[PDB]
Amino acid sequence: DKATIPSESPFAAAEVADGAIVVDIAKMKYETPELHVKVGDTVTWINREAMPHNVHFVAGVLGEAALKGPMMKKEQAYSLTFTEAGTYDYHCTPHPFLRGKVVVE
Ligand SMILES: [Cl-]
Ligand SMILES: [Cu+2]
Ligand SMILES: [Zn+2]
């Protein structure tokens, strides 16, 4: 697989450090739609609104199985560590037009 999961379930956003790599979700947008990171970087998504959101990498992107992240409520967060160089599209399961990309160098 091309990523690992620090926490299988969402956790409180308050636990994320200032300066951690963070993608906010708000107004139906991933606030960094094309994120550039390095191999071994841990990316954390944080939902800032009441509409629940997840991240969903389809089969073939991070492995042979889809990675369907858990739904995050407001002020919940979810992380992935990218372990292999590449480019990875993802979207929100319920809202396929809310989508983004992680570029791992
Ligand atoms: Cl499926
Ligand atoms: Cu969503
Ligand atoms: Zn909905």
mmCIF file of all heavy atoms in Angstrom, residues 52-81:
data_model
loop_
_atom_site.group_PDB
_atom_site.id
_atom_site.type_symbol
_atom_site.label_atom_id
_atom_site.label_comp_id
_atom_site.label_asym_id
_atom_site.label_seq_id
_atom_site.Cartn_x
_atom_site.Cartn_y
_atom_site.Cartn_z
ATOM 1 N N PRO A 52 -21.069 16.210 7.655
ATOM 2 C CA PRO A 52 -19.976 15.235 7.759
ATOM 3 C C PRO A 52 -19.279 15.014 6.402
ATOM 4 O O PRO A 52 -19.921 15.093 5.358
ATOM 5 C CB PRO A 52 -20.685 13.957 8.228
ATOM 6 C CG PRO A 52 -21.980 14.439 8.855
ATOM 7 C CD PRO A 52 -22.373 15.621 7.999
ATOM 8 N N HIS A 53 -17.970 14.789 6.433
ATOM 9 C CA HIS A 53 -17.167 14.575 5.228
ATOM 10 C C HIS A 53 -16.181 13.454 5.505
ATOM 11 O O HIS A 53 -15.830 13.221 6.663
ATOM 12 C CB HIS A 53 -16.355 15.830 4.891
ATOM 13 C CG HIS A 53 -17.187 17.015 4.509
ATOM 14 N ND1 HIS A 53 -17.908 17.070 3.336
ATOM 15 C CD2 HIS A 53 -17.390 18.202 5.131
ATOM 16 C CE1 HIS A 53 -18.536 18.230 3.257
ATOM 17 N NE2 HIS A 53 -18.234 18.938 4.330
ATOM 18 N N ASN A 54 -15.717 12.773 4.458
ATOM 19 C CA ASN A 54 -14.623 11.814 4.614
ATOM 20 C C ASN A 54 -13.597 12.015 3.510
ATOM 21 O O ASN A 54 -13.697 12.962 2.741
ATOM 22 C CB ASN A 54 -15.132 10.356 4.626
ATOM 23 C CG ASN A 54 -15.521 9.841 3.230
ATOM 24 O OD1 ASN A 54 -15.794 10.622 2.319
ATOM 25 N ND2 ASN A 54 -15.561 8.518 3.073
ATOM 26 N N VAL A 55 -12.604 11.135 3.441
ATOM 27 C CA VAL A 55 -11.763 11.069 2.257
ATOM 28 C C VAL A 55 -11.808 9.637 1.771
ATOM 29 O O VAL A 55 -11.831 8.687 2.569
ATOM 30 C CB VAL A 55 -10.309 11.500 2.508
ATOM 31 C CG1 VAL A 55 -10.248 12.975 2.940
ATOM 32 C CG2 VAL A 55 -9.666 10.602 3.547
ATOM 33 N N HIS A 56 -11.817 9.490 0.453
ATOM 34 C CA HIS A 56 -12.080 8.211 -0.179
ATOM 35 C C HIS A 56 -11.126 8.102 -1.361
ATOM 36 O O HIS A 56 -11.206 8.896 -2.303
ATOM 37 C CB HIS A 56 -13.535 8.204 -0.653
ATOM 38 C CG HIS A 56 -13.962 6.946 -1.337
ATOM 39 N ND1 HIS A 56 -15.284 6.566 -1.420
ATOM 40 C CD2 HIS A 56 -13.250 5.975 -1.959
ATOM 41 C CE1 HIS A 56 -15.373 5.422 -2.075
ATOM 42 N NE2 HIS A 56 -14.152 5.038 -2.406
ATOM 43 N N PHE A 57 -10.202 7.149 -1.282
ATOM 44 C CA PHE A 57 -9.267 6.857 -2.358
ATOM 45 C C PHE A 57 -9.735 5.556 -3.012
ATOM 46 O O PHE A 57 -9.812 4.527 -2.340
ATOM 47 C CB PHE A 57 -7.847 6.701 -1.791
ATOM 48 C CG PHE A 57 -7.289 7.964 -1.181
ATOM 49 C CD1 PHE A 57 -7.691 8.378 0.083
ATOM 50 C CD2 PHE A 57 -6.371 8.737 -1.870
ATOM 51 C CE1 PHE A 57 -7.187 9.541 0.649
ATOM 52 C CE2 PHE A 57 -5.853 9.898 -1.305
ATOM 53 C CZ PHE A 57 -6.262 10.299 -0.040
ATOM 54 N N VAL A 58 -10.059 5.590 -4.305
ATOM 55 C CA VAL A 58 -10.693 4.422 -4.935
ATOM 56 C C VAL A 58 -9.680 3.291 -5.153
ATOM 57 O O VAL A 58 -8.484 3.498 -4.997
ATOM 58 C CB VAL A 58 -11.392 4.770 -6.269
ATOM 59 C CG1 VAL A 58 -12.481 5.830 -6.055
ATOM 60 C CG2 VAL A 58 -10.346 5.234 -7.321
ATOM 61 N N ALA A 59 -10.168 2.096 -5.482
ATOM 62 C CA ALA A 59 -9.293 0.946 -5.672
ATOM 63 C C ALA A 59 -8.267 1.240 -6.758
ATOM 64 O O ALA A 59 -8.610 1.722 -7.847
ATOM 65 C CB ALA A 59 -10.105 -0.313 -6.013
ATOM 66 N N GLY A 60 -7.004 0.975 -6.453
ATOM 67 C CA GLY A 60 -5.923 1.251 -7.385
ATOM 68 C C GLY A 60 -5.085 2.442 -6.962
ATOM 69 O O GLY A 60 -3.924 2.544 -7.338
ATOM 70 N N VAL A 61 -5.657 3.346 -6.167
ATOM 71 C CA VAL A 61 -4.924 4.562 -5.802
ATOM 72 C C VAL A 61 -3.851 4.349 -4.724
ATOM 73 O O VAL A 61 -2.690 4.707 -4.933
ATOM 74 C CB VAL A 61 -5.860 5.737 -5.420
ATOM 75 C CG1 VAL A 61 -5.038 6.997 -5.144
ATOM 76 C CG2 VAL A 61 -6.868 6.001 -6.554
ATOM 77 N N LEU A 62 -4.225 3.780 -3.579
ATOM 78 C CA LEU A 62 -3.254 3.560 -2.508
ATOM 79 C C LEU A 62 -2.958 2.071 -2.331
ATOM 80 O O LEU A 62 -2.065 1.687 -1.591
ATOM 81 C CB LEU A 62 -3.728 4.179 -1.182
ATOM 82 C CG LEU A 62 -3.992 5.688 -1.221
ATOM 83 C CD1 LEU A 62 -4.684 6.169 0.050
ATOM 84 C CD2 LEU A 62 -2.701 6.464 -1.471
ATOM 85 N N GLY A 63 -3.717 1.240 -3.029
ATOM 86 C CA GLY A 63 -3.559 -0.194 -2.968
ATOM 87 C C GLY A 63 -4.638 -0.799 -3.845
ATOM 88 O O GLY A 63 -5.333 -0.073 -4.565
ATOM 89 N N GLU A 64 -4.786 -2.117 -3.788
ATOM 90 C CA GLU A 64 -5.770 -2.796 -4.606
ATOM 91 C C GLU A 64 -7.179 -2.628 -4.072
ATOM 92 O O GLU A 64 -8.151 -2.800 -4.809
ATOM 93 C CB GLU A 64 -5.410 -4.272 -4.796
ATOM 94 C CG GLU A 64 -4.336 -4.452 -5.875
ATOM 95 C CD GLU A 64 -4.304 -5.853 -6.466
ATOM 96 O OE1 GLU A 64 -5.223 -6.215 -7.251
ATOM 97 O OE2 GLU A 64 -3.345 -6.587 -6.147
ATOM 98 N N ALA A 65 -7.290 -2.284 -2.792
ATOM 99 C CA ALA A 65 -8.592 -1.981 -2.207
ATOM 100 C C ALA A 65 -8.763 -0.471 -2.067
ATOM 101 O O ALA A 65 -7.800 0.270 -1.875
ATOM 102 C CB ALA A 65 -8.747 -2.655 -0.846
ATOM 103 N N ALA A 66 -10.003 -0.020 -2.154
ATOM 104 C CA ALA A 66 -10.303 1.370 -1.891
ATOM 105 C C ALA A 66 -9.957 1.693 -0.436
ATOM 106 O O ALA A 66 -10.025 0.829 0.434
ATOM 107 C CB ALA A 66 -11.780 1.639 -2.169
ATOM 108 N N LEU A 67 -9.558 2.930 -0.173
ATOM 109 C CA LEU A 67 -9.450 3.388 1.204
ATOM 110 C C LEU A 67 -10.599 4.371 1.405
ATOM 111 O O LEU A 67 -10.541 5.503 0.920
ATOM 112 C CB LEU A 67 -8.093 4.051 1.479
ATOM 113 C CG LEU A 67 -7.713 4.261 2.962
ATOM 114 C CD1 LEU A 67 -6.249 4.635 3.112
ATOM 115 C CD2 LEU A 67 -8.586 5.302 3.670
ATOM 116 N N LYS A 68 -11.660 3.911 2.067
ATOM 117 C CA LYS A 68 -12.815 4.746 2.387
ATOM 118 C C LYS A 68 -12.688 5.214 3.824
ATOM 119 O O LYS A 68 -12.895 4.437 4.750
ATOM 120 C CB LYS A 68 -14.121 3.960 2.218
ATOM 121 C CG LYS A 68 -14.134 3.073 0.973
ATOM 122 C CD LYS A 68 -15.537 2.591 0.585
ATOM 123 C CE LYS A 68 -15.470 1.653 -0.628
ATOM 124 N NZ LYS A 68 -16.805 1.273 -1.177
ATOM 125 N N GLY A 69 -12.332 6.478 4.008
ATOM 126 C CA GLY A 69 -12.112 7.010 5.342
ATOM 127 C C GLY A 69 -13.425 7.117 6.107
ATOM 128 O O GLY A 69 -14.505 7.151 5.510
ATOM 129 N N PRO A 70 -13.342 7.162 7.437
ATOM 130 C CA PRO A 70 -14.553 7.333 8.249
ATOM 131 C C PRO A 70 -15.123 8.743 8.098
ATOM 132 O O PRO A 70 -14.376 9.691 7.828
ATOM 133 C CB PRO A 70 -14.031 7.131 9.677
ATOM 134 C CG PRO A 70 -12.584 7.593 9.593
ATOM 135 C CD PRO A 70 -12.138 6.994 8.275
ATOM 136 N N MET A 71 -16.436 8.883 8.254
ATOM 137 C CA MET A 71 -17.057 10.201 8.182
ATOM 138 C C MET A 71 -16.629 11.044 9.389
ATOM 139 O O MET A 71 -16.684 10.593 10.527
ATOM 140 C CB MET A 71 -18.585 10.094 8.134
ATOM 141 C CG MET A 71 -19.164 9.383 6.902
ATOM 142 S SD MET A 71 -18.796 10.145 5.299
ATOM 143 C CE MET A 71 -19.112 11.846 5.695
ATOM 144 N N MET A 72 -16.171 12.258 9.127
ATOM 145 C CA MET A 72 -15.763 13.174 10.173
ATOM 146 C C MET A 72 -16.877 14.155 10.461
ATOM 147 O O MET A 72 -17.384 14.806 9.546
ATOM 148 C CB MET A 72 -14.554 13.982 9.732
ATOM 149 C CG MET A 72 -13.247 13.229 9.748
ATOM 150 S SD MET A 72 -12.041 14.216 8.851
ATOM 151 C CE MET A 72 -12.363 13.647 7.179
ATOM 152 N N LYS A 73 -17.235 14.284 11.734
ATOM 153 C CA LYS A 73 -18.156 15.328 12.152
ATOM 154 C C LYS A 73 -17.390 16.646 12.296
ATOM 155 O O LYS A 73 -16.177 16.684 12.122
ATOM 156 C CB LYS A 73 -18.858 14.935 13.458
ATOM 157 C CG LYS A 73 -19.842 13.770 13.284
ATOM 158 C CD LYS A 73 -20.730 13.569 14.516
ATOM 159 C CE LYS A 73 -19.978 12.857 15.638
ATOM 160 N NZ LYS A 73 -20.857 12.522 16.805
ATOM 161 N N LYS A 74 -18.106 17.719 12.601
ATOM 162 C CA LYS A 74 -17.496 19.030 12.785
ATOM 163 C C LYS A 74 -16.399 18.954 13.860
ATOM 164 O O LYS A 74 -16.578 18.308 14.882
ATOM 165 C CB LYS A 74 -18.570 20.049 13.181
ATOM 166 C CG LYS A 74 -18.080 21.493 13.252
ATOM 167 C CD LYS A 74 -19.195 22.402 13.771
ATOM 168 C CE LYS A 74 -18.967 23.872 13.405
ATOM 169 N NZ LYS A 74 -17.546 24.280 13.580
ATOM 170 N N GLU A 75 -15.269 19.607 13.610
ATOM 171 C CA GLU A 75 -14.110 19.555 14.500
ATOM 172 C C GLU A 75 -13.597 18.135 14.757
ATOM 173 O O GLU A 75 -13.026 17.855 15.809
ATOM 174 C CB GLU A 75 -14.378 20.293 15.828
ATOM 175 C CG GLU A 75 -14.611 21.809 15.669
ATOM 176 C CD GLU A 75 -13.528 22.506 14.839
ATOM 177 O OE1 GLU A 75 -12.325 22.241 15.064
ATOM 178 O OE2 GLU A 75 -13.878 23.334 13.963
ATOM 179 N N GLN A 76 -13.802 17.232 13.805
ATOM 180 C CA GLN A 76 -13.077 15.966 13.846
ATOM 181 C C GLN A 76 -12.002 15.937 12.766
ATOM 182 O O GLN A 76 -12.061 16.684 11.776
ATOM 183 C CB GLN A 76 -14.020 14.772 13.727
ATOM 184 C CG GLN A 76 -14.897 14.596 14.956
ATOM 185 C CD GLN A 76 -15.625 13.267 14.995
ATOM 186 O OE1 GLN A 76 -16.301 12.870 14.035
ATOM 187 N NE2 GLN A 76 -15.508 12.573 16.127
ATOM 188 N N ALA A 77 -11.023 15.063 12.952
ATOM 189 C CA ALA A 77 -9.885 15.018 12.058
ATOM 190 C C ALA A 77 -9.576 13.573 11.699
ATOM 191 O O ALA A 77 -9.996 12.653 12.393
ATOM 192 C CB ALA A 77 -8.671 15.689 12.700
ATOM 193 N N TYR A 78 -8.834 13.386 10.611
ATOM 194 C CA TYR A 78 -8.420 12.056 10.180
ATOM 195 C C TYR A 78 -7.115 12.198 9.429
ATOM 196 O O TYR A 78 -6.957 13.134 8.638
ATOM 197 C CB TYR A 78 -9.486 11.453 9.263
ATOM 198 C CG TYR A 78 -9.194 10.069 8.737
ATOM 199 C CD1 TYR A 78 -9.235 8.954 9.572
ATOM 200 C CD2 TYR A 78 -8.918 9.873 7.398
ATOM 201 C CE1 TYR A 78 -8.990 7.678 9.073
ATOM 202 C CE2 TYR A 78 -8.685 8.612 6.886
ATOM 203 C CZ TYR A 78 -8.730 7.519 7.716
ATOM 204 O OH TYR A 78 -8.500 6.278 7.171
ATOM 205 N N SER A 79 -6.186 11.271 9.664
ATOM 206 C CA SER A 79 -4.841 11.382 9.108
ATOM 207 C C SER A 79 -4.463 10.210 8.212
ATOM 208 O O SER A 79 -4.965 9.096 8.378
ATOM 209 C CB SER A 79 -3.803 11.472 10.237
ATOM 210 O OG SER A 79 -4.031 12.605 11.056
ATOM 211 N N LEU A 80 -3.556 10.476 7.273
ATOM 212 C CA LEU A 80 -2.916 9.421 6.505
ATOM 213 C C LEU A 80 -1.449 9.760 6.346
ATOM 214 O O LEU A 80 -1.084 10.922 6.153
ATOM 215 C CB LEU A 80 -3.547 9.272 5.117
ATOM 216 C CG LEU A 80 -5.005 8.844 5.023
ATOM 217 C CD1 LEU A 80 -5.448 8.885 3.534
ATOM 218 C CD2 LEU A 80 -5.186 7.441 5.609
ATOM 219 N N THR A 81 -0.608 8.743 6.409
ATOM 220 C CA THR A 81 0.813 8.938 6.174
ATOM 221 C C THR A 81 1.126 8.373 4.807
ATOM 222 O O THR A 81 0.845 7.213 4.540
ATOM 223 C CB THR A 81 1.658 8.184 7.208
ATOM 224 O OG1 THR A 81 1.308 8.626 8.529
ATOM 225 C CG2 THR A 81 3.155 8.431 6.943
#
